[model samples]
Target: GQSVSECITEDGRTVAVGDIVWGKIHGFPWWPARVLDISLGQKEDGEPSWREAKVSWFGSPTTSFLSISKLSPFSEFFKLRFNRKKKGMYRKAITEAANAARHVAPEIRELLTQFET
Candidate 1:
């Protein structure tokens, strides 16, 4: 059996489908995202593989591809303190993250009921 939070790849940090993640895309800055899919790819003969994850943004009806390394687990992500003095806490990115968090709130409650596979 495997723990719900433990990943298939124990050597590295990675996320799976149904996981809430924080990632940056073309128009957002570390926005909240949920993994829709995960695919593996070979980069070389003897190197760590590159895993691409399909994710849906929390702020809008948009999706994008982000690397596994670029994605951080929500458990640690939600506690971030974004710089607002100089950057002005840009509306677009911050707004999106908030809305997405609200939506994910319902799902996160259900996440706790998960069991080892």
Candidate 2:
């Protein structure tokens, strides 16, 4: 694990271990996640490479390693949507809306909710 203050970019911009970042996996949507760990590694020529981060995904317990190059700061809307308590409120609102729509048609709701509960 690394301190939130110690994560930095190739150009020396800084991010924290607990910071939320936006990243994409090969076949997945660009998503926001919390940085959990960071490691510095060497390239074939022995020069330092970009830092790698282990991230805990929002709305799920899954975690994976991603290069710092693959990440960017979260957008303001995403930041608000994923905040600990706010996410729940957002989901609740969605659920209520879905239920009301379901009452009108009862077939289009599709059991959807944003994020894993």
Candidate 3:
């Protein structure tokens, strides 16, 4: 077994923005995205909650806000069980992001394709 990758939200408890990352959407497992911005959000308790991440995705639906908790390093997400679901929109979304990254960076596309079957 290898080591788990590090995300922007490190043990330091801060997010350094402007990197390609994988973020989970309610409709899908996780897909490629670029971290646009970061801001602290509040919980119902009126205490500061986990930070929120603003995203510009490589796939469809454009920009959206995501919880930092849902974001992961783009390196190894395809290895997860969530990739098992099937559908046109799902694959289309996944394809969109994977292709975008391939154009910008092929390193992840190689690992991405390994789980594409």
- The candidate scoring highest on lDDT is 3
**For model 1, where is the 10-residue window of minimal lDDT?**
1-10
| TM-score of candidate 3 against the unseen true structure | 0.59
Q: Could you give candidate 1's per-residue lDDT for residues 1-117 as a string of tens digits?
A: 111332433325456677777776665566667788876655543444666678886646788887666677764454462323323334344444544545645433233223112
lDDT of 3 by residue, 34-84 (tens): 777776644553546556677887646689888777876554454552365
Residues 30-54 of candidate 2 have per-residue lDDT tens digits of: 5567777777765553546546788
Better of 1 and 2 by TM-score: 1
What local distance difference test score does each model get? 0.57, 0.57, 0.62
Residue pairs with backbone atoms closer than 3 Å in model 3 (clashes): none
